[PDB]
Amino acid sequence: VQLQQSGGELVKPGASVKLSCKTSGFTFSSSYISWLKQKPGQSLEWIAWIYAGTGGTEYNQKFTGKAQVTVDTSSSTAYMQFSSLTTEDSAIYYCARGGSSFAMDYWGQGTSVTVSSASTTPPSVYPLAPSMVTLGCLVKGYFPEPVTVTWNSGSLSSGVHTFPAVLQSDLYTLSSSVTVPSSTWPSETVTCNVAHPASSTKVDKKIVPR
Amino acid sequence: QLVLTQSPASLAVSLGQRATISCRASESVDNYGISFMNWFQQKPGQPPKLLIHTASNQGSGVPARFSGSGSGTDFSLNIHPVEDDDTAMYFCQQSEEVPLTFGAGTKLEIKRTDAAPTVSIFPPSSEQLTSGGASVVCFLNNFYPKDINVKWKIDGSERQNGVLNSWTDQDSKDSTYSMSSTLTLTKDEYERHNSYTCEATHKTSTSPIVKSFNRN
């Protein structure tokens, strides 16, 4: 059983997104498909469901107007069109198999919609240099999420902490630390690898002693 | 709209012991001698996963350590024994009446022994200063329990504005938390002072845990 959701989206306020949910592994005609919203660190809000065999829908009044749910029975795909988007609709959207009395037993991977006026902005990357030694990387001033950080091209994995990004002044900042034996650095290279797909940026910062 | 009240907001349970989460629906979710109460487990960045449906029935591939109970308006999730993989958000969810509604969710964490944070302080890099800004960074890594407060001091005087904190969730390997605290200033203010101090209060010590550097 699988529900494959469409890729994340960055749209401006007042826009509309069409989210899709391609399913397989169960009789589509016979099941309910629900759409849900979840903001970071919050609980889930059920938006709507559609019964795929009839195409009939039930909507949560808290969103009615904004959501329109349909299915294309030929391709086992459910859709949600979500309109009059505001910044407060920035969230992860889920489709799930379930609805009515039926528990939601299979879930999509989530589609991350970001609704913002802010422009795509690439990150500035700064080295954090100082027995175990802690090194670090500061990634500042970018938009939208995500940036990813690896050390030594992903081969340096133990002792790594990559912290969730925080939004200030409409730009994100995150940091990552790595702790290595002091015999191993600077004798051996430690490098921060930062990637920001939205701006097509890759940055490698070698950490060298101050 | 049905309101589901979960409790507690978070709990910490030792490996091998019993976790109990409660859900109080403002209203009966019974219909047809069936209680329409569901329980979900969600790990970070993953979709929810159904644990218990119709109050007391296992989800597919859900072991019997997870068990739901209850009728009417009172429901319980029991996890016995708790295993390392069980750190997650737990939500109850009612499918008796439209709109479907979730509880606000309970965070389950693994209780381990105390661990003082390893504190590291970094002055702004010379690269950052060429842009006119200055971030002082403090990492407080691998501590338990999660509760912690960080204070910044500049030449001994506390500075509250311009401080950004971020935390990790419980590490699935050693069950600790980590925290990043960033104090940002202008280059000019940064270079007018000498002593920068990252100060943490944690159960590990009655006294603040202090790390500093002199811009010297």
XYZ file of C-alpha atoms in Angstrom:
426
model
C 0.000 0.000 0.000
C 1.449 3.333 -0.991
C 0.420 6.970 -1.207
C 2.895 9.109 -3.138
C 2.408 12.838 -2.542
C 3.634 15.619 -4.798
C 6.718 17.692 -4.108
C 6.933 20.661 -1.779
C 5.870 24.115 -2.898
C 6.857 27.724 -2.184
C 4.025 30.061 -3.261
C 3.169 33.687 -2.590
C 0.129 34.848 -0.600
C -3.129 34.861 -2.521
C -2.081 31.869 -4.643
C -3.497 28.352 -5.082
C -1.744 24.957 -4.984
C -2.894 21.636 -6.431
C -1.639 18.806 -4.192
C -1.760 15.262 -5.543
C -1.714 11.820 -3.996
C -1.007 8.847 -6.256
C -2.034 5.585 -4.605
C -1.563 1.887 -5.277
C -1.923 -1.432 -3.526
C -5.608 -1.278 -2.606
C -8.946 -1.002 -4.337
C -9.241 2.754 -4.835
C -12.939 2.656 -5.759
C -13.702 1.274 -2.345
C -11.832 3.568 0.058
C -11.942 7.054 1.580
C -9.089 9.529 1.076
C -8.547 12.260 3.675
C -6.474 15.437 3.495
C -4.893 16.842 6.668
C -2.865 19.861 7.794
C -0.088 19.883 10.420
C 1.958 22.887 11.407
C 5.459 22.313 12.846
C 5.217 21.226 16.463
C 1.393 21.168 16.464
C -1.305 18.517 16.104
C -3.234 17.500 12.983
C -6.348 19.206 11.595
C -8.559 17.137 9.317
C -9.453 19.187 6.217
C -11.679 16.944 4.090
C -12.262 13.434 2.807
C -13.556 12.068 -0.493
C -15.125 8.642 -1.050
C -13.422 7.482 -4.212
C -16.237 5.261 -5.486
C -18.763 8.103 -5.687
C -16.579 11.218 -5.571
C -18.630 12.613 -2.706
C -16.856 14.903 -0.253
C -17.183 16.045 3.364
C -15.400 19.211 4.465
C -14.277 20.640 7.760
C -16.162 23.941 8.075
C -12.967 25.610 9.364
C -11.561 25.449 5.795
C -14.637 25.308 3.547
C -14.151 27.455 0.469
C -10.391 27.045 0.485
C -10.338 23.301 -0.225
C -11.643 21.328 -3.189
C -11.028 17.578 -3.233
C -11.384 15.325 -6.261
C -10.237 11.929 -7.501
C -9.288 10.678 -10.939
C -10.475 7.101 -10.777
C -8.531 5.982 -13.854
C -5.144 6.639 -12.165
C -5.874 5.955 -8.450
C -5.007 9.581 -7.669
C -6.609 12.023 -5.230
C -6.212 15.801 -5.507
C -6.623 18.801 -3.258
C -6.780 22.355 -4.569
C -6.132 24.800 -1.748
C -6.854 28.427 -2.641
C -6.711 31.932 -1.096
C -3.446 30.860 0.525
C -2.120 32.946 3.424
C 1.084 32.700 5.441
C -0.872 30.780 8.080
C -1.443 27.963 5.609
C 2.312 27.282 5.626
C 2.398 23.697 6.887
C 2.806 20.041 5.906
C -0.230 18.602 4.083
C -0.972 14.868 4.284
C -3.230 12.554 2.366
C -4.270 9.391 4.232
C -6.392 6.359 3.360
C -9.341 6.577 5.685
C -12.361 8.632 6.573
C -15.869 8.154 7.855
C -15.815 5.417 10.506
C -12.613 3.995 9.004
C -9.362 4.769 10.758
C -6.631 6.314 8.626
C -4.301 3.344 8.324
C -1.985 4.424 5.477
C -0.420 7.851 5.023
C 1.407 9.808 2.414
C 4.838 11.224 3.103
C 3.465 14.783 3.396
C 3.689 17.796 1.052
C 5.343 20.889 2.541
C 3.621 24.109 1.379
C 5.335 27.385 2.302
C 3.301 30.567 1.737
C 5.560 33.606 1.915
C 6.203 36.991 0.373
C 9.947 36.523 0.903
C 12.340 35.940 -1.991
C 14.674 32.955 -2.417
C 17.952 33.890 -0.787
C 21.124 31.751 -0.668
C 22.907 31.085 2.638
C 26.068 32.610 4.065
C 28.264 29.893 5.603
C 30.672 30.592 8.455
C 33.263 28.282 10.061
C 33.198 27.728 13.819
C 36.715 26.876 14.973
C 38.074 26.669 18.586
C 40.630 15.223 24.361
C 37.561 15.876 22.193
C 37.281 19.038 20.155
C 33.998 20.534 18.960
C 33.894 22.257 15.531
C 30.956 23.888 13.877
C 29.201 25.518 10.977
C 26.858 28.513 11.053
C 24.459 28.856 8.095
C 22.743 32.224 8.076
C 20.354 34.336 6.035
C 18.686 31.912 3.629
C 15.154 31.239 2.353
C 13.227 29.007 1.936
C 13.908 25.922 3.927
C 15.595 23.445 3.718
C 19.365 23.660 3.844
C 21.156 20.437 4.657
C 24.537 20.123 6.327
C 26.954 17.200 6.180
C 30.537 16.810 7.393
C 33.239 15.345 5.113
C 30.704 14.669 2.373
C 28.502 12.659 4.722
C 31.242 10.281 5.831
C 31.616 12.072 9.194
C 28.438 11.132 11.013
C 29.069 10.305 14.668
C 29.241 13.236 17.075
C 27.217 15.470 14.737
C 24.348 17.688 15.883
C 22.407 19.613 13.251
C 19.911 21.982 14.825
C 16.469 22.936 13.436
C 16.424 26.219 11.544
C 14.849 29.236 13.192
C 13.173 32.052 11.244
C 14.088 35.604 12.219
C 13.614 38.719 10.048
C 12.209 36.470 7.239
C 15.536 34.650 6.872
C 16.556 31.321 8.341
C 19.600 30.482 10.464
C 20.813 27.055 11.501
C 23.974 25.617 12.962
C 25.679 22.255 13.094
C 28.355 20.982 15.463
C 30.697 17.999 15.186
C 32.920 16.585 17.982
C 36.041 14.640 16.988
C 39.120 13.321 18.825
C 41.745 16.066 19.205
C 44.418 13.784 17.784
C 42.333 13.681 14.599
C 42.034 17.471 13.926
C 43.645 19.541 12.522
C 45.851 16.636 11.390
C 42.870 15.371 9.372
C 40.502 17.506 7.369
C 37.066 18.448 8.701
C 34.751 20.192 6.199
C 31.173 21.462 6.426
C 29.111 20.737 3.262
C 26.031 22.980 2.967
C 23.361 22.565 0.313
C 20.459 24.878 -0.476
C 18.508 23.379 -3.427
C 16.088 26.291 -3.729
C 18.980 28.560 -4.712
C 21.011 25.833 -6.449
C 23.895 26.483 -4.017
C 26.535 24.126 -2.638
C 29.161 25.448 -0.199
C 32.128 23.590 1.336
C 33.873 25.232 4.288
C 37.067 23.648 5.611
C 37.473 24.258 9.327
C 41.005 25.485 10.039
C 42.385 26.650 13.411
C 41.895 30.355 14.213
C -16.741 20.189 17.119
C -15.550 17.412 19.423
C -12.639 18.424 21.682
C -10.159 15.739 22.743
C -8.168 16.380 25.932
C -4.916 14.429 26.223
C -2.726 14.073 29.257
C -0.029 14.482 30.171
C 1.538 16.935 27.704
C 4.754 14.935 28.023
C 6.086 12.104 30.099
C 9.427 10.382 30.522
C 9.492 6.618 31.055
C 12.410 4.268 31.707
C 13.194 1.394 29.369
C 11.142 -1.604 30.425
C 8.511 0.343 32.380
C 4.911 1.292 31.550
C 3.704 4.397 29.716
C 0.071 5.431 30.099
C -1.525 8.235 28.089
C -5.120 9.319 28.610
C -7.634 10.907 26.241
C -10.821 12.603 27.435
C -13.355 13.372 24.738
C -15.696 16.221 25.601
C -18.350 13.830 24.332
C -19.119 10.168 23.752
C -17.527 8.662 20.634
C -19.689 5.514 20.935
C -21.942 4.425 18.084
C -23.344 0.925 17.531
C -21.603 -0.496 20.601
C -18.267 0.572 19.060
C -15.958 3.290 20.400
C -14.529 5.356 17.516
C -11.256 6.264 19.217
C -7.933 5.907 17.369
C -4.319 6.328 18.499
C -1.423 7.468 16.314
C 2.361 7.482 16.808
C 4.410 10.062 14.902
C 8.148 10.212 14.742
C 9.931 13.397 13.675
C 9.524 14.246 10.009
C 7.466 11.091 9.387
C 3.737 10.807 8.816
C 1.557 9.583 11.688
C 1.178 5.848 11.975
C -1.975 4.166 13.250
C -1.390 2.195 16.469
C -4.899 1.393 17.780
C -8.242 1.615 15.995
C -11.758 1.496 17.435
C -10.420 1.936 20.966
C -8.773 -1.463 21.480
C -7.707 -3.053 18.168
C -4.113 -3.319 16.963
C -2.952 -1.631 13.805
C -1.328 -3.880 11.248
C 2.119 -4.876 12.477
C 1.579 -3.132 15.841
C 2.909 -5.360 18.679
C 0.876 -6.052 21.800
C 3.062 -3.778 23.985
C 0.687 -1.135 22.572
C -2.851 -1.525 23.888
C -5.833 0.804 23.949
C -8.725 0.716 26.393
C -11.858 2.636 27.265
C -15.464 3.491 26.446
C -17.677 6.552 26.100
C -15.490 9.557 26.924
C -12.396 8.068 28.631
C -9.625 6.288 26.703
C -6.124 5.077 27.527
C -3.007 4.001 25.645
C -0.694 1.615 27.481
C 2.846 0.882 26.315
C 4.440 -2.000 28.229
C 7.287 -2.480 28.047
C 8.621 0.797 26.658
C 11.488 0.334 24.189
C 14.106 2.737 22.870
C 12.236 3.239 19.599
C 9.109 4.555 21.316
C 10.091 8.203 21.664
C 7.450 10.008 19.576
C 4.316 12.103 19.600
C 1.132 10.190 20.481
C -2.249 11.514 19.345
C -5.698 10.195 20.032
C -8.249 10.804 17.258
C -12.052 10.440 17.084
C -13.967 9.156 14.049
C -17.439 9.284 15.586
C -18.514 12.683 14.265
C -17.519 15.079 11.499
C -15.197 17.012 11.794
C -12.619 14.378 12.686
C -10.525 15.803 15.519
C -7.187 14.999 17.145
C -5.989 15.493 20.671
C -3.166 17.979 21.083
C -0.776 15.055 21.510
C 1.549 13.584 24.163
C 5.336 13.517 23.808
C 6.895 10.297 25.155
C 10.582 10.366 25.990
C 13.022 7.755 27.283
C 14.187 8.476 30.804
C 17.938 7.904 31.205
C 20.404 8.958 33.894
C 21.445 12.586 34.245
C 24.084 13.968 31.858
C 25.693 17.412 32.159
C 25.877 19.320 28.868
C 29.219 19.605 27.064
C 29.434 23.364 26.474
C 31.431 24.923 23.610
C 31.700 28.625 22.828
C 32.856 30.125 19.529
C 33.636 33.758 18.766
C 32.404 35.164 15.440
C 34.539 34.002 12.533
C 36.664 36.658 10.887
C 34.681 35.946 7.695
C 31.397 36.964 9.350
C 32.926 40.219 10.652
C 33.677 41.349 7.087
C 29.879 41.525 6.527
C 29.321 43.823 9.566
C 27.606 41.189 11.753
C 28.894 39.087 14.645
C 27.346 35.877 15.990
C 28.673 34.275 19.169
C 27.713 30.605 19.199
C 27.295 28.280 22.159
C 26.642 24.539 21.808
C 25.332 22.685 24.870
C 25.453 19.077 23.754
C 24.272 15.704 25.005
C 22.427 16.586 28.206
C 19.565 14.992 30.147
C 16.957 15.920 31.385
C 15.790 18.322 28.679
C 15.073 21.311 30.942
C 17.793 23.969 30.592
C 18.175 27.756 30.539
C 20.987 29.669 28.856
C 22.073 33.177 29.761
C 24.549 35.341 27.880
C 26.860 37.871 29.512
C 29.048 40.522 27.881
C 31.787 41.918 30.128
C 29.820 40.319 32.964
C 26.501 42.069 32.255
C 23.572 39.928 31.132
C 22.416 40.407 27.530
C 18.913 39.174 26.659
C 18.192 40.775 23.265
C 19.516 39.150 20.105
C 19.664 35.588 21.431
C 18.392 32.720 19.285
C 18.021 29.204 20.700
C 17.417 25.933 18.858
C 17.204 22.410 20.308
C 17.342 18.871 18.936
C 14.867 16.148 19.823
C 15.957 13.233 21.995
C 18.814 11.379 20.323
C 17.707 7.868 19.374
C 21.137 6.453 20.356
C 22.029 7.950 23.771
C 18.660 9.560 24.661
C 20.136 13.030 25.285
C 19.193 16.475 24.062
C 21.389 19.132 22.480
C 20.947 22.885 22.227
C 22.378 25.740 20.156
C 22.335 29.339 21.432
C 23.415 32.203 19.161
C 23.969 35.761 20.332
C 24.135 38.156 17.383
C 25.522 41.703 17.564
C 26.889 44.298 15.217
C 30.587 44.063 14.479
C 31.083 47.431 16.171
C 29.425 46.425 19.455
C 31.158 43.048 19.364
C 34.580 44.679 19.104
C 33.891 47.128 21.913
C 33.848 44.372 24.531
C 36.259 41.731 25.686
C 34.653 38.933 27.694
C 31.821 36.756 26.285
C 30.104 34.172 28.464
C 27.576 31.440 27.779
C 25.864 30.465 31.050
C 23.627 27.385 31.473
C 21.448 26.295 34.359
C 20.720 22.555 34.455
C 19.730 19.906 37.004
C 23.338 18.619 36.897
C 24.565 21.523 39.049
C 23.154 23.986 41.576
C 25.548 26.629 40.145
C 25.462 27.990 36.589
C 27.650 26.120 34.119
C 29.962 28.737 32.606
C 31.987 28.871 29.402
C 33.611 32.022 28.136
C 36.359 33.518 26.031
C 38.144 36.851 26.040
C 38.318 38.550 22.643
C 42.043 38.892 23.453
